[PDB]
Amino acid sequence: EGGQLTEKVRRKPFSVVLFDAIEKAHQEIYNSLLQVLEDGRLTDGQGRTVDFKNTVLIFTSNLGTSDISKPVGLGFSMKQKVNDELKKHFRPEFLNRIDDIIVFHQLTREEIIRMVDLMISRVAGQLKSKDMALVLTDAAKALLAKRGFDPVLGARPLRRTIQREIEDQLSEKILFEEVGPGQVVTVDVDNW
Amino acid sequence: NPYNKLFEERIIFLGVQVDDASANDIMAQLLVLESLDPDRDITMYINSPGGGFTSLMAIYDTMQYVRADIQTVCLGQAASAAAVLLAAGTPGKRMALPNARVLIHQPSLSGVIQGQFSDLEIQAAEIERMRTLMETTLARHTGKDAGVIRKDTDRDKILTAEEAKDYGIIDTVLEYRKLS
Amino acid sequence: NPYNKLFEERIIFLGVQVDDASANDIMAQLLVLESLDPDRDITMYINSPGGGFTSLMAIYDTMQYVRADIQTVCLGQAASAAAVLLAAGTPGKRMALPNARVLIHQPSLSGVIQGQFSDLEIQAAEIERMRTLMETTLARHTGKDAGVIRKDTDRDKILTAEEAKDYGIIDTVLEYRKLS
Amino acid sequence: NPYNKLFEERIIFLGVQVDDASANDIMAQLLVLESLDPDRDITMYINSPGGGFTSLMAIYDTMQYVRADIQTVCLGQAASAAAVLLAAGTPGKRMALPNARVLIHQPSLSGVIQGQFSDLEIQAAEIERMRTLMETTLARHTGKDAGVIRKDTDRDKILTAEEAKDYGIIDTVLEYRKLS
Amino acid sequence: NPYNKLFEERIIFLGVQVDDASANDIMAQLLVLESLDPDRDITMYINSPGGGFTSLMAIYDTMQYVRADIQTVCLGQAASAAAVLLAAGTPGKRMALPNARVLIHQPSLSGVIQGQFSDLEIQAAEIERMRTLMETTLARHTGKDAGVIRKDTDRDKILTAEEAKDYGIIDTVLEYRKLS
Amino acid sequence: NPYNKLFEERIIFLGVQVDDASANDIMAQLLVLESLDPDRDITMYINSPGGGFTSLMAIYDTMQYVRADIQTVCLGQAASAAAVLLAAGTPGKRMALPNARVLIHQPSLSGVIQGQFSDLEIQAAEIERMRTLMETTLARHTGKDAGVIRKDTDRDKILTAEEAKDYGIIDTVLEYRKLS
Amino acid sequence: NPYNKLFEERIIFLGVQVDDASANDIMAQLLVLESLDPDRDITMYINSPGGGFTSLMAIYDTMQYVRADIQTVCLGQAASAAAVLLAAGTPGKRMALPNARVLIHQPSLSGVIQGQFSDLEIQAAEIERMRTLMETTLARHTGKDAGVIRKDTDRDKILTAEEAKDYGIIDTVLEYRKLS
Amino acid sequence: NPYNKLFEERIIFLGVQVDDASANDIMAQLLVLESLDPDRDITMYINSPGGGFTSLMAIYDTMQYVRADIQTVCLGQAASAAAVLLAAGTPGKRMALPNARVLIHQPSLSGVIQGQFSDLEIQAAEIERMRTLMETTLARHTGKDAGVIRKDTDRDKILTAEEAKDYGIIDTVLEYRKLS
Ligand SMILES: CC(C)C[C@H](NC(=O)[C@H](Cc1ccccc1)NC(=O)c1cnccn1)B(O)O
Ligand SMILES: CC(C)C[C@H](NC(=O)[C@H](Cc1ccccc1)NC(=O)c1cnccn1)B(O)O
Ligand SMILES: CC(C)C[C@H](NC(=O)[C@H](Cc1ccccc1)NC(=O)c1cnccn1)B(O)O
Ligand SMILES: CC(C)C[C@H](NC(=O)[C@H](Cc1ccccc1)NC(=O)c1cnccn1)B(O)O
Ligand SMILES: CC(C)C[C@H](NC(=O)[C@H](Cc1ccccc1)NC(=O)c1cnccn1)B(O)O
Ligand SMILES: CC(C)C[C@H](NC(=O)[C@H](Cc1ccccc1)NC(=O)c1cnccn1)B(O)O
Ligand SMILES: CC(C)C[C@H](NC(=O)[C@H](Cc1ccccc1)NC(=O)c1cnccn1)B(O)O
Q1: For H172, how many CA atoms within 13 A lie in the half-sphere containing its CB?
Q2: β-strands C172-173, B101-104 pairing
Q3: Degrees (nearest 5) of the Cα angle B132, B135, B138?
Q4: Which atom of ligand 3 is found nearest the CA of D110?
Q5: CA distance A177 to A10
Q6: Element containing residue H44 per DSSP (H, E)
Q7: Atom of ligand 2 nearest to the CA of C84
Q8: How far apart, in whole angstroms, are the C-alpha atoms of residue D8 and residue F9?
Q9: How far apart are CA F132 and CA D88, in angstroms?
Q10: Residue B42 belongs to what H/E stretch?
Q11: How far is the CA of E125 from the centre of ligand 4 (A)?
C-alpha cells in the first residue's frame, strides 16, 4: 500500500485525481508531480508507467482564510488574495504547467438556500417510499442556511445540519408511534 | 522560546519602557493577533515604567481598535503611560498581581525644550492637551469625573493593586494558584 | 515575525525617525510591494517623529510613484516629515487613529551650519525651497492654498486626528472594532 | 546549550541583576513551566545581587501565582530582591549552597531623585511602603514578626546559609554529593 | 527581504553615505549583476548625501566598466559624489524623482589635515586634481564645458530634478503612476 | 567548534574573569555534565585572573556538589578566585601546566564603597568572613593550618606550579607528551 | 551574498583599512583560494587607504607565497600599504581603474611613541628598515632603483592610474566594457 | 569559511593580540587537533603583536603539551609573546615568511600598577621571574645561553626572518612557490 496508483489510474486512464490540501504537503512530494504535468507519465516505486494522460488532475488549497476569518484582517482598515498566496507558498515551476486556476467566492444567502433545496429533496424520495411526506416550507430552509453555513467551512456541514435538525425530530414520529397510512409532517424550529 | 509561546497563546508582553520602538512592536502584535482570531481575547502583560504619550496613544488606540478583548495584567509596575494602558483593557478583564504597583501621574517633559515664547505656548498647549487626553482616557476606563483624576494625578499617585481596583484602574486582583 | 507578516499583508511600517536609512528601507519596501501586486493597496503605518527633507521626498516620491494606492494610517504620531507622508496617501485612504497626533511645522536646520555668507545665502535659499516644497506638497494633498499652510506651519501646528481630518491631512478617523 | 537543558528540566536560572528585563525573562519562564506541567516543581536558581522592587514583586507574585512549587536554590549570593525571592520559595523547598551568601537590607534609592517636597513626600511614602512590603513579604516566608525584620534589615544583614536557615530565609543547606 | 528583491531584479541601492564600505558593496554588486546578465540594465537607486572622492571614483569606474547600462534613479538626494554617480548613468537612462534634490559642489576636506607646507602643497594639488576630475567627469556626462561646472560647483549648487534635467545631470524626471 | 568539543569530552573551560556571568556559565556546565554522566570525571581548565567571592563560592560549591570528580588543570594563570577553584579539585586530580602561575591573595574591595561607619563595620565584617572563608576553603584543599594561609595570602603569593604542588594547590605538574 | 560570490569566483576584496584584522582575513582567503585551485589566478580588489607595515607584509608575503597569480585591481584608492599590495601582483596582471588613485609614501608613526632615547633609537631603526623594506619591495615590483622610490616617496606621491602605469605600480589601466 | 578550512587542515591561526581570550581559543584548538590526529603536525600561523605572559605560557605549555608537532609560521609579525610562541615550535618546523618581523623584548607592565612597596616588591619579583622565564623558554628553543637573550632582549630586538634564523627563533625562511 503506497504505490497503489497502478490499481487506480492505469486501471482507469479516464479518471479524476483530487489532491486535497496540497499546501500541507512537502516540497519533494510535488517535485515528483512535475513529471505528470509535463509528460503525463509517472514512475512508480515498483517500476510502472502510471499514465496520467487522460486524467483531469485537480489540486486543492484553502490558501485563503483571511476574510474567511471574520470581516477583519492584519490592517487598521478576495479572489486575488488567494492567488498570491499560491505564489507565496509554492514554487512557480509547479503552478504554470497547471491549466486553469479556479477561485471560489463566499456564497450568497440566495446561493446557499438552493443547495438546501437540492439536499432536502434527496431524503424526500426516501420518505414517500414509506408514504411519508415532509411538507416543504421555506421558513425552515432559511434557518438551515443560517445554521449549516460558516465562512470557514460552510456548505459541507449543511448535510449534518439536515440530519441533526430535521431527521432527529422525524424519528420522534415513530417514538410516539406515528405510522398510519401516512402522516403529513411539517416542522419548524424556533427563530434565531 | 518563551516570548514566542506567550505570543502563540495570544499574550502580548509589554515589558519595557514605552517608547516609539516598544509601541511599534505591540501594534504589530495587536493586529496580528487580531488577524489570527479576532474573537479570542488578547492578553497584554504590563511591567512597564511608562513614558511617551504618542507611544501611549499608539498602543492605546490599537488595543481599542482590535475586535479582540484586551486582558491587561499588571505584573510588577504600570507607571505613567503603562497605567493608562492597564486601564485600557476591556472592563472585567483588567487584572493586576497582588504586589503590582500602579503609578498614575500627569504628563511631563523629560528635559527642557528651548524656544521662543510663541514656540513654548504651543509646547505647553500640547502638554495641556496631553494632560486632558490622559485624564479623559483614564476617566472612560475608571469611571471617574476626569477632574478627580486631575486632582489625583497632580502628583505621582502610586496605587497598590487592591487600591487600583478601588480606583478603577484594574478590575480584579489576581489570586494565587500554587496548588499548595 | 510580526514585521514580516505586516509586509506579507502589504503593510509598510514607518515607525522610526525619518532619516536616510529609514527612507532607504521604505523605498525598498514600496517597490517590492509594487512588483508583487501593483493593483493591490499598500498600507503605510506612520508612528514617526519626522525629520529629514530629502528623506521625506525620497519616501514621498516613491509612494507617489508606485501603481498601488498608499493607505497611510497614523498610529500615535506623524510629526514633521511624517505628517507630509501621512497626507501623501491617496485621497480617501488617509487614515488616523483617534488619539494620533499630527504635527506640521516648517523645515528646520537641526544645529547650526557655519560658512561664509555666500554659503549661507544658498543654505537659506535651500531651506526656503524646502519650505515652499513642503507647503506645495501639503497643498496638493490637503486642498489648501499653500499660503494658508505657510501661516499654519509658521509654528508647530499640532493636529488631533479629528482636526487633521478637517485640515485635510487625513480623510478618516479610524473607528474601533472591539466586539464590545 | 546548558541554559536550555536547565529550562527543559524545569530550572529557571535567575543569575543576573534583578531589573525589568531580568524580571521579564523569569515571568515568561515561570508561566511556561506552569503550562508545561503545573504539578511538577519549578526550581529557581538564584545568584543575583538583587536590585529593583517592582522587578522583585513581578518575579515574586509570578512565582507565588503558579501552581507549581518553586524550589529556590541560592548559589553564591541572594542579595536584596534575590534574598526575598529566595524566601519566596515554597516551605521545605528553599535551599542554599553551604557557602552561599544571603544579604537582606531595606529598600534604597540608587541615586538621588530631585523634586519639590510634595514630590518627595510621595517618593518617601513609596519607599516606606516598599520597605513595609519587603518586610511583610519576608515575614510571611520566614515566620518573623516583620518588626524583627525591620530591626534586622536596618543595615545590610549578611546571612551565611547555615544562619539563613535559622533566620528562615532557606529551609535546607545543601549537602554535597561528590561520590568521593 | 526587500533589498534582496531589488538586487534579484538588478537594482543596486546606494542609499547611504558614500564611504569606502559603501563603495565596496556597490562594486561587489555591480560586478555580480555584470556576471548574471551583462546585456540587461543594472538600475542604481541613489539617495545618498555623497562624500568620498576615491569612493566616488571606485563606484564611478565600476559602473562605467560593466557591460550593462546603468540606470541611475535619484530618489530624494544626490549630493556631492552621489550627484556625480547620478550623472554617471548611461545617457537616456539617468532618472530622478520629481522632488529629488541634486547637489553638486567642489570637493572638500572634511576637517583640517596638518603637515608641513611641502605636505600641504601636495594635499592641495590632490584636491585640485580631485576638483578637475570631478569637473571632467561631470562634463563628459552633462555635456558642459568643465569650466562652466567649475563656475557652477564653486558653491553648493542645489538642482531640482527638473533643472537637473536642464543641467544634464539626469535625462528624465520620472512621472507618477497614481494621479492622486 | 572547539569549546563544544571540550564540553562534549567533559571539559569545562573557565578562561575568563570570574564574575557573575562567568560563574553562571560554569554552574550550568557543572550540572549538565553531572547529569550526563555523574561517575565520569569533569575536567575544569583554569586560565582565569580570578575576581569575585560570591562568584567564586558559586563555582566552588557547585564543583563540590556534583558527583563527578573535578579535574582542575591550571593553564597559564589561576589568580585569586581561580586559585581557590584550582585547589577545589578532587585530591590527586589537581593539575597544572609547568609554567602556569598560581596567585593566592586575600580578598579585596575593587574600588571604595562609601557609607556610614555602621555600614562600613558590616562591609568590613563581610570581607573578614570573606577572608576567613577563603582561608578555610584553601586549608581544606591544601592541608594547611588556615593561619599559615593567612600569613601566606597576606600579600600576593605567586606560586610556580612546582611550588604550588609543594603548597598543596595542585597535586601534579603536567609532563609534556610531544612524541618528539 | 555579493562578497561570497566574489570569493567563489576567486576575488579577494581588500576594501578596508589595512590593519591586523584586515590582514588576517586576506591571508585566510589567499590560502583557501590557493587550496581550491593553485593554478587559477586569484584576483585582489584594492580600495584601501593603507596603514600598517606588519599587516602589509603579512598580506604581501602571503600573496607572494601562493602558487596562484595575484591579479591586483585598484578600484578607487591604493594608498600607502595598499599601493605596495597593488604593486605586489604578478607582472602583467596589475590593473587599475582609470580614475583610481595610487598614493605611495614612506612609512609613518601614527601618533607619538614615548620612551628613552635607547628605546627611540630602535623605534627609529625600525621605521628606517620599514622604509627600506617598503622601497626594496616597491623596487622589485616597479623596476626602479629603490633610491628613486626614496626620492619619490619622500612625500605623498599621488599617482593617477595612467601614471601609476608609467611608474610601474600597475601594468594596465582598465578599459570600460559598457556595451553602450 | 576560510578559518574553518585552515582548522580542518590543522592550521591554528593566532592572528590577534595575545590576551586571555586569544589564548583560550588556541588551547581549545591545540587540544582538538591533538584529539583528531595526535601524530599529524599542527601548524600555527603567527601574525601577532604579542602581549600577555600568562596568556603566552598558556599557549606555550599547550603547544608543548600536545603529541603533535607544532609548525610555527610567522606571517608578518611575531612580537613579545608571539615571538616566544614562534620559537615554541618543534625544531626544524619553525618557519617564517621572508619579510616577517620577529620582535623579542623583555616583559613589561602595560600601565602603572599602584600599591605599597611590599606589594610592589612582589609585582617586581613577578616580572623578574616573568623575565627569567621568558629567557629560559627562549633559550631552550634558540640554543642560547639565556644571559645572551637577557642582553639581547634588554631593548626591543627586531629580527628579520633571515636573522631570526641565525638567532634561532625560526629554522627556515620560507621560499616562494608562485609558479611564475
Ligand atoms: C501618564 C502618561 C500621559 C505618560 C506620562 N507622560 C510623560 O511624562 C512622558 C514623558 C517622556 C517619556 C519618555 C521620553 C520622553 C518623554 N510622555 C511623553 O512623551 C510626554 C512628552 N511631552 C509631554 C508629556 N509627556 B509618563 O511620564 O510616561
Ligand atoms: C516636513 C518637514 C520638512 C519639517 C521638518 N524638517 C526639518 O526640520 C528637517 C530636520 C533636519 C534633518 C536633518 C538635518 C537638519 C535638519 N530639516 C531638514 O530635513 C533639512 C536638512 N538639511 C538642511 C535643511 N533642512 B521635520 O523635522 O521633518
Ligand atoms: C528588596 C528590594 C527593595 C530590592 C532592593 N533594590 C533596591 O534598592 C532598588 C534600587 C533602586 C533602583 C531604581 C531607583 C531607585 C532605587 N530599589 C528600587 O527598586 C526602587 C525603585 N524606585 C524607588 C525606590 N526604590 B535591594 O537592593 O534591597
Ligand atoms: C563632488 C565629489 C567630488 C564629492 C565631494 N568631495 C568631497 O568633499 C568628499 C569628502 C567628504 C565629504 C563629505 C563627507 C565625507 C567626505 N570627497 C573626498 O573624499 C575628498 C577628499 N579630499 C578632498 C576632497 N574631497 B562631496 O563633498 O562628497
Ligand atoms: C580568592 C578569593 C577571595 C577571590 C578574591 N576576589 C575578590 O576579592 C572579590 C573582589 C572583586 C574582584 C574583582 C572585581 C570586583 C571585586 N570578591 C568579591 O566579589 C567581593 C565583593 N564585595 C566585597 C569584597 N569582595 B581574589 O581577588 O583574591
Ligand atoms: C607604504 C607602506 C609602508 C605603508 C605605510 N606605513 C605607515 O605609515 C604605517 C602607519 C601606521 C600604522 C599603524 C600604527 C602606526 C603607523 N606604519 C606602520 O605600520 C608602523 C607601525 N609601527 C611602527 C611604525 N610604523 B602607509 O602609511 O600605510
Ligand atoms: C615577551 C613576553 C614575556 C611577553 C611580553 N611582555 C610584556 O610586555 C607583557 C605586556 C603586558 C600585557 C598585559 C598586561 C600588562 C603587560 N607583560 C605581561 O604579560 C605582564 C602581565 N601582567 C603583569 C606583568 N607583565 B610582551 O607582551 O610585550
Answers
A1: 13
A2: unpaired
A3: 150
A4: 16
A5: 53
A6: strand H42-48
A7: 1
A8: 22
A9: 30
A10: strand B42-48
A11: 15
